[PDB]
């Protein structure tokens, strides 16, 4: 009686045609969660570009800045699950920027200008060192998403 990771693709073997549409200013990394909940990096999309790709029903994707791992949205939410194509039409995955808090946006920029080695050189309140060092990552987001999921059910 072992649970499987809740955030994983279902192994359907049922093809689904999808168009990844990068409507962000970032280089996008598509991340596919495999059948064991392990994230797999896919080829990146430059900004302003769209690409018709081959996936499957019940597979699970998310999208990150390929340079910094900042989280992006897809169809206004965090995860994307293809269904079966109806009447010969592709499914669209519209990848956009979130409205970041000013704080997170500021952290993104400082992080882009300062090497992690040097964060504690900066003349700012100690707690911002912890914030700068807390790089966005998928592991953290999977945790957060699961937690939000469990909150919604309970």
């Amino acid at each position: 009686g072992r649970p499987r990771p809740v955030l994983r693709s279902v192994n359907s073997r049922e093809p689904s045609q999808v168009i990844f549409c990068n409507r962000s200013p970032r280089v996008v990394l598509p991340v596919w969660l495999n059948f064991d909940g392990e994230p797999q990096p896919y080829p990146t999309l430059p900004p302003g570009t769209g690409r018709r790709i081959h996936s499957y029903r019940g597979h699970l994707w998310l999208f990150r800045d390929a340079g910094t791992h900042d989280g992006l949205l897809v169809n206004q939410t965090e995860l994307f699950v293809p269904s079966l194509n109806v009447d010969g039409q592709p499914i669209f995955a519209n990848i956009t920027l979130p409205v970041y808090t000013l704080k997170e946006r500021c952290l993104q920029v400082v992080r882009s200008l300062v090497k992690p080695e040097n964060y504690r050189r900066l003349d700012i309140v100690r707690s911002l060192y912890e914030d700068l060092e807390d790089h966005p990552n998928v592991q953290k987001d999977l945790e957060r998403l699961t937690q939000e999921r469990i909150a919604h059910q309970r």
Binding site: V110, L113, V114, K115, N118, R121, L122, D123
Partner: protein
């Protein structure tokens, strides 16, 4: 589309939005709601250039491409009382310090 503005006089800045189709008169009716000075006591500028009440914001040069929520366009404000006209004077914001070494 929507245009996003900073109305500036002396050391006061008003953040407001409007339409490209909006008139300068309509814009002054906005400022009146905030500062309690009627349109006829207001003079609005784009840089050195006085704006006609009848013209629209788009006609004055205020486009959605150049008047964005994250980088709004500036409109100069100077008051008038009958035959007396206040000079347009907008005090600059402060300057950032020199960029720290660890960012260079």
């Amino acid at each position: 589309m929507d245009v996003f503005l900073m109305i500036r006089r002396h050391k006061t800045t008003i953040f407001t939005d409007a339409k490209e189709s909006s008139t300068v008169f309509e814009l002054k009716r906005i400022v009146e709601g905030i500062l309690k000075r009627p349109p006829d006591e207001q003079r609005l500028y784009k840089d050195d250039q006085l704006l006609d009440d009848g013209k629209t914001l788009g006609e004055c040069g205020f486009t959605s491409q150049t008047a964005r929520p994250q980088a709004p366009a500036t409109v100069g404000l100077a008051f008038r009382a009958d035959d007396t006209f206040e000079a347009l004077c907008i005090e600059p914001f402060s300057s950032p310090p020199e960029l720290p070494d660890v960012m260079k």
